[PDB]
C-alpha cells in the first residue's frame, strides 16, 4: 500500500487537497424559521455534504485499499461524527454560534427552534470552545477527521459466524501513520517532546466527545424522522438505519 510509504508531509498534503468544499444552504433569510423549516434546511445541507464526504473518503490515503464492504461500513459508522467535527471546525471563529453554512449561521437560542435540538447545539458549541482553547490547526483537523473515518467502525467488524472481532491490520497501520503525522506536525510547530504526547492525547480525547454527540445527534434526528417533522432523503434514511435505536 503506497499510503504506507508516504512521508508525514505527503500525508498532510494529501489530506489538505482532499478536503471537501464548504457548501451553501438554500435558506431564504427573509423567510421565518419554524421547527420543520429549520430541520429541512439542515437535513438538506447534510444530504448534499454526504455526497462530498463519500468522494473525500476515497481520497484519504489507504481508504480505497479496503473492500467496498469495509468502506461502506466505516462511512455508515462515522458520517455524523465527520459532519459534526467539520461543523465545529467551521464554527471555531464564531463563538456562541454554529456555522452550518456561510449563509446559515445559528446561535444557541436559534437551536431552541427545533424540539430537543438545543441540547445538541450546546454540545457542539462547547466542543467549538475546546477547539479555540487548544488553538487547533487545520493540519490537525484533517488528521482528526481521517482518524474518525478509519477508527469509528473498526471494532465493529465481526466475523459472520461466531461474531468475533476481525483483525484489520491495514486500517491500524494507516491510523498509526496518521499518529506519526500528527506528532511530526507538532514537532515542526516547535512543541516540546513532552508537549507532543500531551497535545496528542488532548486531540484524541476530543473524539470521545464527538462520538457522544454523534450518538445523541443520531437519536435526535431519528426522533424527528419518526414524528414526521421533516422528510429525509433516501441516502439519509439509509445512513440513519445503519444505526440502532
Amino acid at each position: 500500500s503506497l499510503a504506507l510509504s508516504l512521508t508525514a508531509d505527503q500525508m498532510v498534503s494529501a489530506l489538505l487537497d482532499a478536503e471537501p468544499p464548504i457548501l451553501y444552504s438554500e435558506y431564504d433569510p427573509t423567510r421565518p424559521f419554524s421547527e420543520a423549516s429549520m430541520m429541512g434546511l439542515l437535513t438538506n445541507l447534510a444530504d448534499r455534504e454526504l455526497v462530498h464526504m463519500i468522494n473525500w473518503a476515497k481520497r484519504v490515503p489507504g481508504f480505497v485499499d479496503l473492500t467496498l464492504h469495509d468502506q461502506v461500513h466505516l462511512l455508515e459508522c462515522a458520517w455524523l461524527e465527520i459532519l459534526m467535527i467539520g461543523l465545529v471546525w467551521r464554527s471555531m471563529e464564531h463563538p456562541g454560534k454554529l456555522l452550518f453554512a456561510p449563509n446559515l449561521l445559528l446561535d444557541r437560542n436559534q437551536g431552541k427552534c427545533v424540539e430537543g435540538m438545543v441540547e445538541i447545539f450546546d454540545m457542539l458549541l462547547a466542543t467549538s470552545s475546546r477547539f479555540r482553547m487548544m488553538n487547533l490547526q487545520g493540519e490537525e483537523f484533517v488528521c482528526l477527521k481521517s482518524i474518525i473515518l478509519l477508527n469509528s467502525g473498526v471494532y465493529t467488524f465481526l466475523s459472520s459466524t461466531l461474531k468475533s472481532l476481525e483483525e484489520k491490520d491495514h486500517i491500524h497501520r494507516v491510523l498509526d501513520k496518521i499518529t506519526d503525522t500528527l506528532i511530526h506536525l507538532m514537532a515542526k510547530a516547535g512543541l516540546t517532546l513532552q508537549q507532543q504526547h500531551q497535545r496528542l492525547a488532548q486531540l484524541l480525547l476530543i473524539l470521545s466527545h464527538i462520538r457522544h454527540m454523534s450518538n445523541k445527534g443520531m437519536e435526535h434526528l431519528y426522533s424527528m424522522k419518526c414524528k414526521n417533522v421533516v422528510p429525509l432523503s433516501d441516502l439519509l434514511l439509509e445512513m440513519l438505519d445503519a444505526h440502532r435505536l
Partner: peptide
C-alpha cells in the same frame, strides 16, 4: 444501497 453505489461510481 445508495452509499454502496455512490462509493463505486
Amino acid at each position: 444501497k445508495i452509499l454502496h453505489r455512490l462509493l463505486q461510481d
